[PDB]
Design a binder for this molecule. Structure first.
Ligand SMILES: Nc1ncnc2c1ncn2[C@@H]1O[C@H](COP(=O)(O)OP(=O)(O)OP(=O)(O)O)[C@@H](O)[C@H]1O
Ligand SMILES: Nc1ncnc2c1ncn2[C@@H]1O[C@H](COP(=O)(O)OP(=O)(O)OP(=O)(O)O)[C@@H](O)[C@H]1O
Ligand SMILES: Nc1ncnc2c1ncn2[C@@H]1O[C@H](COP(=O)(O)OP(=O)(O)O)[C@@H](O)[C@H]1O
Length: 748
């Protein structure tokens, strides 16, 4: 609370290497730190300034963290101080803390920096008694004893640290790597070019794998699972197999830490030599390096930064001389404070486990999803697939609703994974106008060839519903022999789904199972924390939001009022509102009354009249029937005549058919499989007498993100979890963020 951090001060620090998002962390850490009545102190140049001190520990204001969200790298500054790795230095830093009076320390760093603060919290007890032989009056130690709180905030493009689902910057890092391959990829038209990108990752194959999974890398090399035995043949057999199979380029991604069975490291150049000496294609190595850390932080990292930042400060002010070292982080999409020590002691475990040829233990300590990506990567990466028999179940996949960045990525694994099960996969053009009009084709392994990155809807998606035409579709699911349905779409996929169950009452054909994969820009589908195409949309809003915070204004001081899309769902606006640090984001799920709206302005003004020079006001395209854009606009204008200028922008639905970011391509790839695996089951389990009869509710689901796991939920079970008037779910997780979004704008 406002009185919580009163009579309390904290010093934030940014050790480790530049990770896009650190800046948002700091900001949040300062903004929320003040807010809690506490005092926040900067500490330029990572652990260094802490050791040094003096002019390296300046005090932060609120205006100080202004306009940082959008900036990459660290601004508080990051060094490499090795003096701290020794006590002949930690003691001087401590001196600096106690000399400046500070009981809380936020460390935004990596596996090492984090492990350093760790050992610091520990070797802190004796640090007093020793720095007492001559340090400062012993009156202080008896006034700052077993009270040295430190929160570790994980920032690293490695995504190595264990205990956190994501680290800062890795998504942006993912964007960089992606934009390149995205470009490498869309040019190779001449010779059978064969790029050999080498990407980051000391000991972690993460970025390397994930980047292969989004590009459709032809082969990959990662640490935790070295290519044991004669592979070159394999890799060449492959590259040639695929060469004659008809293809232009090839993208062999290589993690830096890429080693082999024994350990004698695989080299990006070596790889390059191989292919040329054995196959002789014009191969060309590239080594992205230190650019992955560049560019600007993606919508996710800015957001993730702010969330972690707030978590830290809370965790800092909620500490007790009996509470252990803390490391806040994300998991199952919610903040968590984890035992610093436990995290380090383990995140280390993986290294040794890897030092000993024990890679199974490696890939395990890493495990879960990682292991999955690996598994799914290889599968979809195959050149094959198997020989199609006859007793094979035949599935149909289709798109329904407005298009999304990821649909084609989902349709591609759905078909590949299907085909690899030995099942048949039909492809439907134009959603439900699909099984109905009869536009249905058989999709072979190549049909989906290189789609994972293409945006829009290759198959065609319409929003029309099934019911009105059960006759024709059922007529068709019999003719073509459809025996399961995979629907990638948004609300009218969920909705058209329910619409299918009822049919199971009047029709026996509709008595097949179906899974609904959420693909909607708006993130309005019930039964999942995320949907495919939101991140992509979101990243574009957040982008143009930043580009608009410029405008060739004939003078400074100016306020922008922007209307986002997403019908009644305040996900984008709220999120974008937070990613681009707007003063206000008017959404539906959170009703405003002119009594408020007023106060929201008799506020930005009190700011445009000082600190702030550009203002951001986000409005959900449906937050309120009366208080339209134009209303909010005009209100904000008049009220600020003289003090500032103002323009109003309506983004609207700027062709959401651009291109999927790496996260939607992964998300749509991972599910498209998860579903096609789950569905192959429900189809066996529903085969009875030379016919299938799914008439239970389990056979009709929507697969979605729900906390730490993906989960199949039956459409009917969700009916009472969804407001159909406004086509949105009831209980949106993110409404939990609104408050932080508000304190960062300096409210309450
Ligand atoms: N093992 C350690 N013990 C104590 N302090 C450390 C340790 N490792 C790093 N530090 C502190 O952090 C500084 C920078 O370390 P480092 O470059 O490893 O950052 P990091 O958090 O490990 O991120 P990265 O994954 O890029 O290594 C060191 O100079 C020292 O100040
Ligand atoms: N794309 C890939 N990247 C890295 N390793 C791969 C890839 N594809 C297969 N492998 C490796 O090849 C070995 C398994 O071969 P599998 O028998 O699983 O594929 P395959 O049928 O021989 O090849 P294809 O599927 O290219 O004919 C394992 O080491 C597996 O990790
Ligand atoms: N861009 C993002 N937007 C929302 N959540 C994200 C994003 N990137 C990662 N996450 C979170 O990271 C965790 C999932 O990581 P993971 O299983 O490795 O999937 P991927 O392999 O797609 O990262 C979840 O908490 C997920 O919500």
């Amino acid at each position: 609370a406002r009185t919580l951090g009163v009579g309390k001060a904290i010093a934030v620090l940014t050790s480790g290497g530049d990770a896009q998002g650190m800046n948002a962390a700091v900001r949040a850490v300062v903004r929320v730190g003040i807010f809690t009545g506490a005092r926040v102190f900067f500490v330029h140049e990572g652990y260094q300034g802490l050791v040094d001190g003096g002019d390296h520990i300046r005090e932060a204001t609120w205006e100080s963290v202004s306009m940082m969200l959008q900036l990459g790298g660290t601004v508080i500054g990051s060094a490499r101080c090795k003096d701290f790795r020794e006590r002949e230095g930690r003691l001087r830093a401590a001196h600096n803390l106690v000399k400046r009076g500070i009981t809380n320390l936020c460390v935004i760093g990596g596996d090492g920096s984090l492990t350093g603060a760790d050992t610091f919290r520990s070797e802190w007890s004796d640090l007093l008694s020793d720095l007492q032989k001559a340090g400062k009056i012993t009156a202080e130690e008896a006034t700052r004893s077993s009270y040295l709180n430190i929160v570790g905030l994980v920032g690293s493009i490695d995504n190595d640290f264990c205990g956190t689902d994501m680290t800062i910057g890795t998504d942006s890092a993912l964007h960089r790597i992606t934009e390149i391959v995205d470009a490498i990829t869309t040019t190779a038209q001449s010779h059978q070019r064969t790029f050999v990108l080498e990407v980051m990752g000391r000991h972690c194959g993460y970025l390397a794998l994930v980047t292969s999974l989004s590009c459709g890398a032809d082969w990959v090399f990662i640490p935790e699972c070295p290519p044991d035995d004669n592979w070159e043949d394999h890799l060449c057999r492959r590259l040639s197999e695929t060469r004659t199979r008809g293809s232009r380029l090839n993208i062999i991604i290589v993690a830096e830490g890429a080693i082999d069975r024994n350990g004698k490291p695989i080299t990006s150049e070596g790889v390059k030599d191989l292919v040329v000496r054995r196959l002789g294609y014009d191969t060309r190595v590239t080594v992205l390096g230190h650019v992955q850390r560049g560019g600007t932080p993606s919508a996710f990292d800015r957001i993730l930064g702010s969330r972690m930042g707030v978590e830290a400060v809370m965790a800092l002010l909620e500490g007790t001389p009996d509470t252990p070292a803390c490391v806040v982080s994300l998991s199952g999409n919610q903040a968590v404070r984890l035992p610093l020590m436990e995290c380090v002691q383990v995140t280390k475990d993986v290294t040794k486990a890897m030092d000993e040829k024990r890679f199974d233990e490696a890939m395990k300590l890493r495990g879960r999803s990682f292991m999955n990506n690996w598994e799914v990567y290889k599968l979809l990466a195959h050149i094959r697939p198997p020989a199609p028999k006859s007793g094979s179940y035949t599935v149909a996949v289709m798109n329904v609703g407005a298009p999304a960045a990821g649909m084609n990525a989902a349709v591609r694994s759905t078909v590949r994974i299907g085909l690899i099960q030995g099942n048949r996969v039909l492809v439907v053009h134009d959603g439900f106008e699909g099984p109905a009009k009869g536009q249905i084709e058989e999709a072979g392994w190549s049909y989906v060839g290189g789609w994972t990155g293409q945006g829009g809807s290759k198959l065609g998606s319409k929003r029309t519903l099934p019911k009105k035409s059960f006759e024709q579709i059922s007529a068709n699911i019999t003719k073509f022999n459809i025996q399961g349905l995979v629907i990638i779409g948004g609300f009218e996929a969920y909705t058209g789904g329910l619409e299918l169950m009822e049919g199971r009452k009047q029709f026996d054909e509709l008595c097949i199972p179906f899974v609904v994969i959420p693909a909607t820009v708006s993130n309005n589908v019930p039964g999942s924390d995320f949907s495919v195409g939101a991140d992509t949309a979101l990243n574009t809003i957040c982008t143009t939001c930043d580009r608009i915070k410029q405008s060739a204004a004939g003078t400074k001081r100016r306020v922008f009022i922007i209307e986002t899309m997403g019908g009644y769902c305040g996900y984008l606006a709220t999120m974008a509102g937070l990613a681009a640090g707007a003063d206000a984001a008017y959404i539906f799920e959170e009703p405003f009354t002119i009594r408020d709206l007023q106060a929201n302005v008799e506020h930005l003004v009190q700011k445009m009249k000082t600190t702030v020079k550009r203002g951001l006001v986000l409005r959900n395209e449906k937050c309120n029937e009366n208080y339209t854009t134009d209303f909010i606009f005009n209100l904000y204008s008049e009220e600020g005549k003289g003090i500032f200028d103002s323009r109003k922008n309506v983004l609207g639905h700027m062709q959401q058919g651009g291109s999927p970011t790496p996260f939607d391509r992964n998300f749509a790839t991972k599910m498209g499989a998860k579903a096609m695996n789950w569905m192959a089951g429900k189809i066996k389990e529903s085969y009875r007498n030379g016919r299938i009869f799914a008439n239970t509710p389990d056979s009709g689901c929507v697969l979605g993100m729900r906390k730490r796991a993906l989960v199949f939920q039956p459409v009917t079970e969700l009916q009472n979890q969804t407001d159909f008037e406004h086509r949105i779910p009831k209980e949106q997780w993110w409404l939990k963020l609104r408050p932080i979004l508000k304190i960062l704008a300096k409210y309450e």
